[PDB]
C-alpha cells in the first residue's frame, strides 16, 4: 500500500565525500573504498535524528517498510536536500528523541501489551 521508495545512493563520489566529512564527531577523511561506486542502488540508514526531517512517510521496498523524507541540514545523513530512506525501527537501545522511529517503537510495545493482555484474558 505505501508507494515504492526512490532512495538512491550518491550520484557522484564527491557528494558522498562531502556529507560523510561533515557528519557530527568526524575525525578522519573517508576512504575511497567505502564510497559507493557504479550504478546507484537502494540504501537505508539505521538511525536518523528527529531534527533532520520536517516530516516522514512510509515507503515499501522488497516487501519491507521504510521511512522516507527530505533532509534539512548538511550535517544530517544523506546530504542537503536529498531524499533518503531509513529503517522502520532504530537500533535497539538507541533513541532519536521522538520522531517516527520512536513512535514505531512505542506502537510495537503497545501492540505487544495489548495482545499479551488478551492472552491473559483467554
Amino acid at each position: 500500500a505505501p508507494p515504492p521508495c526512490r532512495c538512491m545512493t550518491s550520484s557522484s563520489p564527491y557528494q558522498e565525500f562531502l556529507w560523510r566529512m561533515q557528519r557530527p564527531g568526524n575525525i578522519d577523511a573517508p576512504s575511497y573504498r567505502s564510497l559507493s561506486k557504479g550504478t546507484p542502488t537502494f540504501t537505508a540508514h539505521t538511525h536518523m535524528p528527529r531534527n533532520c526531517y520536517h516530516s516522514a512517510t512510509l515507503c515499501m521496498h522488497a516487501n519491507t517498510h521504510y521511512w522516507t523524507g527530505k533532509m534539512i541540514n548538511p550535517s544530517c545523513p544523506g546530504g542537503l536536500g536529498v531524499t533518503v530512506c531509513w529503517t522502520y525501527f532504530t537500533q535497539t537501545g538507541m533513541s532519536d528523541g521522538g520522531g517516527v522511529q520512536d513512535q514505531a517503537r512505542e506502537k510495537h510495545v503497545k501492540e505487544v501489551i495489548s495482545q499479551l493482555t488478551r492472552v491473559h484474558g483467554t
Binding site: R23, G25, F89, T92, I113, L116
Partner: protein, 440 residues
C-alpha cells in the same frame, strides 16, 4: 524529648519514605478512580511535571560535580597511590559484577520464567542490531572524547548503512555523535588532568584550589536541591504508576520474570554486598544502608544512577564519614562502571529470552554470557532505560532471537529502578570498604 530529637535529626529520611508511600498510594488511588483516560493528556503532563523537574535539577549538577570532584580527587593523591586505589576499586567492581551476574543466571535457571512461554506472543520487521566489535570500538571511542565541549552533551555511537537489500547486503558501518552525555570520557579526562595538575606544582595548586571551591559551591546547590527531592520523588512514582495500564494483568504471566529479577536484586543487596562489607571491615553494613536510605529512594524514583550521584556523595560525606578525597574519587567512577543491578537484569532477561525460544543453554554459552554481561556493563549509560542497549549487545553475542525484546521492555519500568538501587548500593559499599582500608 529523645523522640523529638530523633525526628529532627532524621527529618529528611522520614520525609523521603513518607513521600514514597504517599506517591504509591496516590498513584493507585488515581488509577483506580480514573487514570490517563479520566483526565486529559494535558492534565497528565501537568501532573507528572514536578518529578521531571526534580530529574532535570539533578541532571544539571552532574557535569560540574563529576569534573571538579575527579580533578580534585586525582590531584590530592600520589599518582602511584591513585593507581593502586583505582586498581583495587576495579577489582572490587568486577568481583561484584561477576557475583551479581552469576546469582542472576542461577535464579533465572532455577525458576524458569520462559518455561510456559504463554503463546509465544512475538511480526512486522526485525530491529537492526549492533555488532559486538563495533560496540567495543564505540566504548573505546567514547573514552578519550574528540571534543570536550561536544562530549558534555553528546556521545559517539556507530550506525549502519544497509545497502543493496536485494543485492547482497553489505551493512557498511558509518558512525556519528548522537545525543546523550559522555560521562566516561569526561571522567577519564578529569582523572588525567588531575594527575597532570599534581605533576605540575604550584600552578597545579592554584587550579586545585579553583576546582575545590567550585565543588563546594556545587555541594551547596546539592544541599538546596535535596530538600525539594521528596516532592519530585512522590510525583515520579505516582505519575509512573498512573500512566502504566492494567496492573496485575501484565503480571499474571510475567510474575516469574519479575520474581527472578527482584529476588536477585534483594539477595545481592542484603546478603552479598553486606557480607563483603562485614568480612572486610567488621562494621555494621546496615548502618551504612540506613545512612544512604534517601539516595536509594531517590534512585528508585528517578531510575538513573547518574542523577543520584550528588545526593549519594553528600550522604556518604556526612553520615558514615568516609573521607572527602576517597569518596569523590570512587563514587563518580562507580556511577558509570559498577552496575550490578544492570548486569543481573541483563543475565536474567537473556536467560528468559532463551527459554522463550526453547534453546539449550549448555556451559560455554553461560560462560560467554557472563563474560559479555560483565564486560559490557562497564561503559553503560546511567540514564533511565540504559540497560536495553547492553542487553541487545549481549543477545547479539549469545546468538539468540531479538524479536522478543518487547517483552523485556514491557515491564522494565520497575526492574530498571531496582537495578538503579542495586548499582548505587554497590557504589556506596565499595566506598565503605575503601574508607575502612585507608583508615587502617
Amino acid at each position: 524529648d529523645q523522640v523529638r530529637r530523633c525526628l529532627r535529626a532524621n527529618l529528611l529520611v522520614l520525609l523521603t519514605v513518607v513521600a514514597v508511600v504517599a506517591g504509591v498510594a496516590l498513584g493507585l488511588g488515581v488509577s483506580g478512580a480514573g487514570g490517563a483516560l479520566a483526565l486529559g493528556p494535558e492534565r497528565l503532563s501537568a501532573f507528572v511535571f514536578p518529578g521531571e523537574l526534580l530529574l532535570r535539577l539533578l541532571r544539571m549538577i552532574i557535569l560540574p560535580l563529576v569534573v571538579c570532584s575527579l580533578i580534585g580527587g586525582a590531584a590530592s593523591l600520589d599518582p602511584g597511590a591513585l593507581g593502586r586505589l583505582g586498581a583495587w576499586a576495579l577489582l572490587f567492581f568486577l568481583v561484584t559484577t561477576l557475583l551479581a551476574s552469576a546469582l542472576g543466571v542461577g535464579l533465572a535457571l532455577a525458576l524458569q520464567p520462559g518455561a510456559a512461554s504463554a503463546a509465544i506472543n512475538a511480526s512486522a520487521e526485525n530491529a537492526p542490531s549492533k555488532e559486538v566489535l563495533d560496540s567495543f570500538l564505540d566504548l573505546a571511542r567514547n573514552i578519550f572524547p574528540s571534543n570536550l565541549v561536544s562530549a558534555a552533551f553528546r556521545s559517539y555511537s556507530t550506525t549502519y548503512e544497509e545497502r543493496n537489500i536485494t543485492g547482497t547486503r553489505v551493512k557498511v558501518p558509518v558512525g556519528q555523535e548522537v545525543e546523550g552525555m559522555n560521562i566516561l570520557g569526561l571522567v577519564v579526562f578529569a582523572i588525567v588532568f588531575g594527575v597532570a595538575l599534581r605533576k605540575l606544582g604550584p600552578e597545579g595548586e592554584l587550579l586545585i584550589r579553583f576546582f575545590n571551591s567550585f565543588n563546594e559551591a556545587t555541594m551547596v546547590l546539592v544541599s538546596w536541591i535535596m530538600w525539594y527531592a521528596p516532592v519530585g520523588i512522590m510525583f515520579l512514582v505516582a505519575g509512573k504508576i498512573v500512566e502504566m495500564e492494567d496492573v496485575g494483568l501484565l503480571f499474571a504471566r510475567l510474575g516469574k520474570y519479575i520474581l527472578c529479577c527482584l529476588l536477585g536484586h534483594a539477595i545481592h543487596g542484603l546478603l552479598v554486598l553486606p557480607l563483603i562489607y562485614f568480612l572486610f571491615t567488621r562494621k555494621n553494613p546496615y548502618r551504612f544502608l540506613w545512612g544512604i536510605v534517601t539516595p536509594l529512594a531517590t534512585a528508585f524514583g528517578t531510575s538513573s544512577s547518574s542523577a543520584t550521584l550528588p545526593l549519594m556523595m553528600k550522604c556518604v560525606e556526612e553520615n558514615n564519614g568516609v573521607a572527602k578525597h576517597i569518596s569523590r574519587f570512587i563514587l563518580p567512577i562507580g556511577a558509570t562502571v559498577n552496575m550490578d543491578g544492570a548486569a543481573l537484569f541483563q543475565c536474567v532477561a537473556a536467560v528468559f529470552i532463551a527459554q522463550l525460544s526453547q534453546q539449550s543453554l549448555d556451559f560455554v554459552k553461560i560462560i560467554t554470557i557472563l563474560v559479555t554481561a560483565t564486560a559490557s556493563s562497564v561503559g553503560a549509560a546511567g540514564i533511565p532505560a540504559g540497560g536495553v542497549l547492553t542487553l541487545a549487545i549481549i543477545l547479539e553475542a549469545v546468538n539468540l532471537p531479538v524479536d522478543h525484546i518487547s517483552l523485556i521492555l514491557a515491564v522494565d519500568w520497575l526492574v530498571d529502578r531496582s537495578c538503579t538501587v542495586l548499582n548505587v548500593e554497590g557504589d556506596a559499599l565499595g566506598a565503605g570498604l575503601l574508607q575502612n582500608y585507608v583508615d587502617r
